[PDB]
Amino acid sequence: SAYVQRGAIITSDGVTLAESVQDDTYVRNYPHDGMASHTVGYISTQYGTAGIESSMNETLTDWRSALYSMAGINTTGSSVVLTINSQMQAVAEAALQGYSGSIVVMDPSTGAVLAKASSPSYTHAELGTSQLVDRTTQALYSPGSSFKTVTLAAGIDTHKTTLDTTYSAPGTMEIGGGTIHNYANEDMGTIPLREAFARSSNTALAQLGVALGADNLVSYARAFGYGTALGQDFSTTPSLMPNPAEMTTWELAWASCGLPVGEHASPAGPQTTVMQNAVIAAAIANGGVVMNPYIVDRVLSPEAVVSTTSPKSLGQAVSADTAAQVREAMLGVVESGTGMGARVPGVKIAGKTGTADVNGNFNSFFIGFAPYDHPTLVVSVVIEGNGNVLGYGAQVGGRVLAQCLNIQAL
């Protein structure tokens, strides 16, 4: 019974990305084919199901059921309005041209997903003939130094350190009978924690992770969403941490810098999605309150609003006082650290950059928010370095935030 019409799939700003119309039976049409493909999704025998087409299937859809001739006359499908804004979507899609990776733009107060793009992408048209993977929510990456945001937050929240507390940050250092090294083996001397965060010193942040311990580190990661399949109305694979009881001191050290090196029955970690990284930046921008992200704003009757999604919290991961300290440390990253490439004249941007083990992978990450005072937008980015993309995450991130803020101002 493809005689029952399906409701449309539309952007918050009124752009239709999926319809239905035949003389025979209805055909699924995809206008602006190629825009937010992974999010819009599909139902294909060959390629499986994905996105809204699948997750909101029933919404999109006795005595009369026995008659096929009547399936269409009684009921047509109710439409779906996403939180995705088409102009922000176009900005994120343009920013990924020529690259493999993903971008998420979200509202920090509610967890609403304003833009979600994975690259390389595809068109529904090509489904009738890597690309299919949704790198925002169904791909796992070592977060690298982007994860230090969690270590720093945990350290401040447990009252074990402060931003002005100093740490030795040599090029190399032995921990747990293994070695930890700063990027390019750079010796930075003794420096305050806010500077170690801004210049992203592994040796310094590993020490904080060792001081917090495995239970704490894991507990805070989970408080930010690790272990949860994020998304009220979309699927996300859970970000993973090990079983703290199984971690070693050296493992712990690296995990606190975002590199999973453990070997035990439990998953090594951290392993993150780009959406998880957005959720963390949102929480810090949102006074420590973690929101479960969502992509559906409301369901419309074939006629009228049937339902409205309500924002929901996953709890408070850290105190507001802690959240303000981490925001300030994130401002240093961009103003004087490794995130200077994210700066946009006329607007204050804060964030945290990320680099993995340059062992093979040269992926570039960036999480951030803007404007610094009263943030109204969060961005999470991964740029996959196939064959060197140092700092690209930050450049992409800054540019995306700025353009999205201008769209928001209109």
Side-chain angles (χ1 to χ4, degrees), residues 190-210:
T190 287
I191 61 173
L193 182 56
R194 64 177 70 248
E195 182 185 349
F197 188 76
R199 304 171 88 192
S200 206
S201 163
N202 290 327
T203 48
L205 274 286
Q207 291 178 65
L208 178 56
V210 166

Side-chain angles (χ1 to χ4, degrees), residues 11 91 141 148 158 178 231 250 384:
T11 71
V91 162
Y141 300 88
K148 298 176 178 170
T158 60
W250 179 77
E384 300 174 4

Side-chain angles (χ1 to χ4, degrees), residues 127-147:
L127 296 180
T129 72
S130 173
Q131 288 167 314
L132 302 168
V133 174
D134 180 353
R135 299 174 154 78
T136 65
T137 55
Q138 295 181 339
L140 289 170
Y141 300 88
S142 301
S145 38
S146 68
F147 191 76

Side-chain angles (χ1 to χ4, degrees), residues 59 143 270 357 374 380 395:
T59 310
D357 48 337
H374 310 101
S380 181
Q395 298 186 17

Side-chain angles (χ1 to χ4, degrees), residues 52-63 65-173 175-291:
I52 296 297
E53 287 292 22
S54 76
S55 72
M56 296 293 117
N57 186 20
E58 302 179 356
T59 310
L60 299 167
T61 296
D62 282 334
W63 77 277
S65 65
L67 285 69
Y68 282 47
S69 57
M70 289 199 326
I73 214 73
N74 187 2
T75 60
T76 60
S78 60
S79 294
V80 170
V81 184
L82 305 182
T83 50
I84 298 289
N85 176 286
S86 75
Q87 299 199 68
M88 290 185 187
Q89 186 69 27
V91 162
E93 292 174 350
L96 290 169
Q97 290 289 329
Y99 297 109
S100 291
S102 63
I103 292 180
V104 172
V105 181
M106 153 180 314
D107 175 51
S109 60
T110 59
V113 175
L114 305 177
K116 175 170 173 298
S118 188
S119 179
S121 194
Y122 57 89
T123 60
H124 291 78
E126 299 170 351
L127 296 180
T129 72
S130 173
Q131 288 167 314
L132 302 168
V133 174
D134 180 353
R135 299 174 154 78
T136 65
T137 55
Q138 295 181 339
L140 289 170
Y141 300 88
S142 301
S145 38
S146 68
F147 191 76
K148 298 176 178 170
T149 302
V150 171
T151 308
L152 180 55
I156 286 169
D157 204 64
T158 60
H159 300 305
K160 299 197 81 160
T161 199
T162 71
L163 293 180
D164 301 316
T165 296
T166 65
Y167 287 77
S168 185
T172 190
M173 161 167 199
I175 301 188
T179 298
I180 304 300
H181 68 272
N182 279 331
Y183 177 86
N185 297 137
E186 178 186 7
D187 186 349
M188 306 171 192
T190 287
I191 61 173
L193 182 56
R194 64 177 70 248
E195 182 185 349
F197 188 76
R199 304 171 88 192
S200 206
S201 163
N202 290 327
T203 48
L205 274 286
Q207 291 178 65
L208 178 56
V210 166
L212 283 155
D215 287 8
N216 276 329
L217 190 66
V218 167
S219 179
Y220 277 97
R222 293 177 58 85
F224 286 102
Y226 276 70
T228 296
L230 301 171
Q232 293 195 50
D233 44 21
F234 66 86
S235 296
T236 299
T237 199
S239 291
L240 309 175
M241 289 297 286
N243 172 341
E246 298 174 17
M247 292 189 70
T248 64
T249 290
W250 179 77
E251 176 187 350
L252 178 55
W254 277 117
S256 75
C257 303
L259 298 179
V261 303
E263 47 205 30
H264 35 66
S266 65
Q271 302 184 61
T272 192
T273 54
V274 166
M275 177 67 66
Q276 177 69 70
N277 254 356
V279 167
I280 285 170
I284 295 296
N286 195 42
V289 182
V290 187
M291 307 300 275

